[PDB]
Amino acid sequence: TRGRVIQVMGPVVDVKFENGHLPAIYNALKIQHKARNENEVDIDLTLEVALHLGDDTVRTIAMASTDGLIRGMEVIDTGAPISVPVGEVTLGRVFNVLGEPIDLEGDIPADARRDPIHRPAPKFEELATEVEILETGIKVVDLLAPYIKGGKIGLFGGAGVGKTVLIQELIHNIAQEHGGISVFAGVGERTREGNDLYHEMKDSGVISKTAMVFGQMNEPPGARMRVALTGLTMAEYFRDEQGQDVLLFIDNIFRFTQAGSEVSALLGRMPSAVGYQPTLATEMGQLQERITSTAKGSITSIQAIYVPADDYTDPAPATTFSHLDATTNLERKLAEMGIYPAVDPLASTSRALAPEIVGEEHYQVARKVQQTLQRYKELQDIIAILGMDELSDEDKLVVHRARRIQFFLSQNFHVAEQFTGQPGSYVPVKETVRGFKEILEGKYDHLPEDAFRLVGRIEEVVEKAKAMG
């Protein structure tokens, strides 16, 4: 079951095989060689079948560097698309597109099960029916932008808005109250970043519960394009095998689609709108659909969508958005004021917010708490005009209530306990509904601002009223 290297065009490599046996499309080809002489340099490389050109020749795209190849080398066929470790082995571990641990904690034993990264989406009969909301125990989220169990949330922004913490906290709250593991997939992860990220999760300790994958930038278009799949696979395990609800983070899913058109060229594909691989929708559709809640488990994905030049019509994001059930929009503003999480209360949206889904109770208060904000937001102009006096009392009530509200959206993050000391919070939607409904009834208007700013259940705000002595 062996073949030989015909042509090596950069990241594109042709193999080839001697009659009969041809490796199937997407099958992992291993090229291991070794230095026979001093005129060669040891080769460890892997390839993926892409096109059967014919004349018993396949076109593969290297997941690593092709410097050092020479026509004729024997290409071993693995007989299966890129398998990667799946299990309790992955947790607290860091891998690459291949599934090779890139950390220093030793390697994976030949024991451990391995699954192929390519695979069809769950059958129409498998994945679930009732639309059920995945509890984050994070106020702003569960209320103004609810997560749908086994769905996709756009995470926008990410310069000094504490987006890392929000992820970190998320992995934590799931693995605790929902008892389910997280798998982060840095796709085209900038290495400086990939390093901090890991360390940050070593100090926070959210790593014990998550699998780390790095498709780093300096990787070839192949590698970057398939990283998402590796992380995803590792995730699916815990969904179907252990029937959990697992988190799949993909930091910048654009890198993926970008790698997509990037690879598409090499294979000689005629470009599509804006030089995008014509196969874009398809490549995205196959990545998302494999993310959902099965009759057994579920997989919730948080993909940081970094939109192309501020254009929300670009086929790249525009494609992504069709796969979105939610958005968590982080803004540096609310951070500068001392509201963390920095989740924008009027921007960050969600599909779960609907009477049909969350009933009137939630939808009512929630849609209201938004209204009282888009009131306090517009009065910013009139407040610099007629000041805080006699600006219309039906408004001053808004301005008062609204301040406490946008303050009570800030929460205690467990992950934050590292350097703060306050242990952190987990508030169910139930709790978060009351705390707001009550505040919207004004039952708190007699309490200081710096009460509802960084707390848990409404009752905590109240205890925060003992200034002692």
Partner: protein, 477 residues
């Protein structure tokens, strides 16, 4: 033997498709019977595309092509320091050969995730604008993007010239740049004495594309040496926009399927796999560093251009140099607005960390405000106050050329205006103030600026507060 050499089918435009060479490694050096070197890129079934590195006219059909069995490596050593060589390492400065023992391959993998340590140790650019607002630590990557004739080079230069007391062994890679300029530049280094720590790798605009293509990587190679030793390197790739272009030519010649804006599909991989090679090695590795300064020349300042965008997303932040600022006589032509350093602040030292925090503010508002003066004939509010020290900070951010500033007496001036100890002085006199406020210190605060050195902190606040008056209270007007 019979295979390991080949015969030239086609010649032209720096490219040679040869027969034979059935054993050439993709990326192997191949020599032509005429002595001119080259490189194998396309290894196809019936032939091999080579990119001639050097004169391609002395090449015809049938000429023999014999392998080397080496992957494009380059000289490396403690003897290049002070020498001007091409991407091949071949001295062009016309003083002797470069006598070096060791060597390193151009293509090399970057330090592994674990291998590195979050950058903390700064790079003192000696430029108030930069190491206050857009700070750069060792092991970082700061892309300085801007339209031609904005000063991009100037910065890199004065930066290097600022590396004497710091421990930094500097490397200036010139790609596409006029060999004219590169000379007048390598000299102004000669005069300031940058050559004692500074390596110069050039491929001018007369040299063939493949050299341009190779120059950047050939540069990092020589850097990498001092890095894996534990020393600290600073590589200035001057103009990746050109190198990235030179690759397009070369790659198009090999008739590689062209992508968006004609650039090959791996054009992104090109730079990515390059820039990553600069970082901060973990203490486990000797804690070395290689800091990279990628240039991107912009047309019209279109940040939305394909190449300029890639590199923007690749680096840790960038420094965007306004085209107009430069003419209006504001040097450096920095745009504090778009200019950002992501690794920032761990790079700055406490003594800056404080007096820099507010610096962004005052300058921020002024950017969002001073669009209005002529209509400000009614100058109103306290919005006049924001402008106040605002227009003054700009003055302080204006620096000379070929005149770096040490952090010590830098944090003090970035202190003065930010505390009001400047505000009582009109803009007319701001520049020619900080000028003697330095000397006033180099004589009478020479004790004060010390605490600033040895502690990198100012917990200072009290003394300087009064000690600053010691000056304004003797200055002219």
């Amino acid at each position: 033997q019979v295979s390991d050499v080949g015969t030239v089918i086609q010649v032209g435009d720096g490219i040679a498709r040869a027969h034979g060479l059935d054993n050439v490694m993709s990326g192997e050096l191949v020599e032509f019977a005429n002595g001119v070197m080259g490189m194998a890129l396309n290894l196809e079934e019936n032939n091999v595309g080579i990119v001639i590195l050097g004169p391609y006219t002395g090449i015809k059909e049938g000429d023999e092509v014999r392998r080397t069995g080496r992957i494009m490596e380059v000289p490396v050593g403690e003897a290049l320091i002070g020498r001007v060589v091409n991407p091949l390492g071949q001295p062009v400065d016309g003083l002797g050969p470069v006598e070096t023992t060791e060597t390193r391959p151009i293509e090399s993998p970057a330090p592994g995730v674990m291998d590195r340590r979050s950058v903390h140790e700064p790079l003192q650019t000696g430029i108030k604008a930069i190491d206050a607002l857009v700070p750069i630590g060792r092991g970082q990557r700061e892309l300085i993007i801007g339209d031609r004739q904005t000063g991009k080079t100037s910065v890199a230069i004065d930066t290097i010239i600022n590396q004497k007391d710091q421990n930094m062994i500097s490397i200036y890679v010139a790609i596409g740049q006029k060999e004219s300029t590169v000379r007048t530049v390598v000299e102004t280094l000669r005069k300031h004495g940058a050559l004692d720590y500074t390596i110069v790798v050039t491929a001018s605009a007369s040299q063939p594309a493949p050299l341009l293509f190779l120059a950047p990587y050939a540069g990092v190679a020589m850097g990498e040496y001092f890095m894996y030793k534990g020393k600290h390197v600073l590589v200035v790739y001057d103009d990746l926009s050109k190198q990235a272009a030179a690759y397009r030519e070369l790659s198009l010649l090999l008739r590689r399927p062209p992508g968006r804006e004609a650039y090959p599909g791996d054009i992104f991989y090109l730079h990515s796999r390059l820039l990553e090679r600069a970082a901060k090695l973990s203490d486990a590795k000797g804690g070395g560093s290689l800091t990279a300064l990628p240039f991107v020349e912009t047309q019209a300042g279109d940040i939305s251009a394909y190449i300029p965008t890639n590199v923007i997303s690749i680096t840790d932040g960038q420094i965007f140099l306004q085209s107009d600022l430069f003419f209006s006589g504001v040097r450096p032509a920095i745009n504090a607005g778009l200019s950002v350093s992501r690794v920032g602040g761990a790079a700055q030292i406490k003594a800056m960390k404080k007096v820099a925090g507010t610096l962004r503010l005052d300058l921020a508002a002024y950017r969002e405000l001073e669009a209005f003066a002529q209509f400000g004939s009614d100058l109103d509010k306290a919005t006049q106050a924001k402008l106040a020290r605002g227009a003054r900070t700009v003055e302080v951010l204006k620096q000379d050329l070929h005149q770096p500033i040490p952090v010590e007496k830098q944090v003090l001036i970035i202190y003065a205006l930010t505390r009001g100890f400047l505000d009582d002085i009109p803009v007319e006199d701001v520049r020619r103030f900080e000028k003697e406020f330095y000397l006033f210190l180099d004589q009478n605060g020479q004790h004060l600026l010390e605490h600033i050195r040895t502690t990198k902190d100012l917990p200072d606040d009290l003394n300087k507060a009064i000690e600053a008056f010691k000056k304004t209270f003797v200055v002219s007007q």
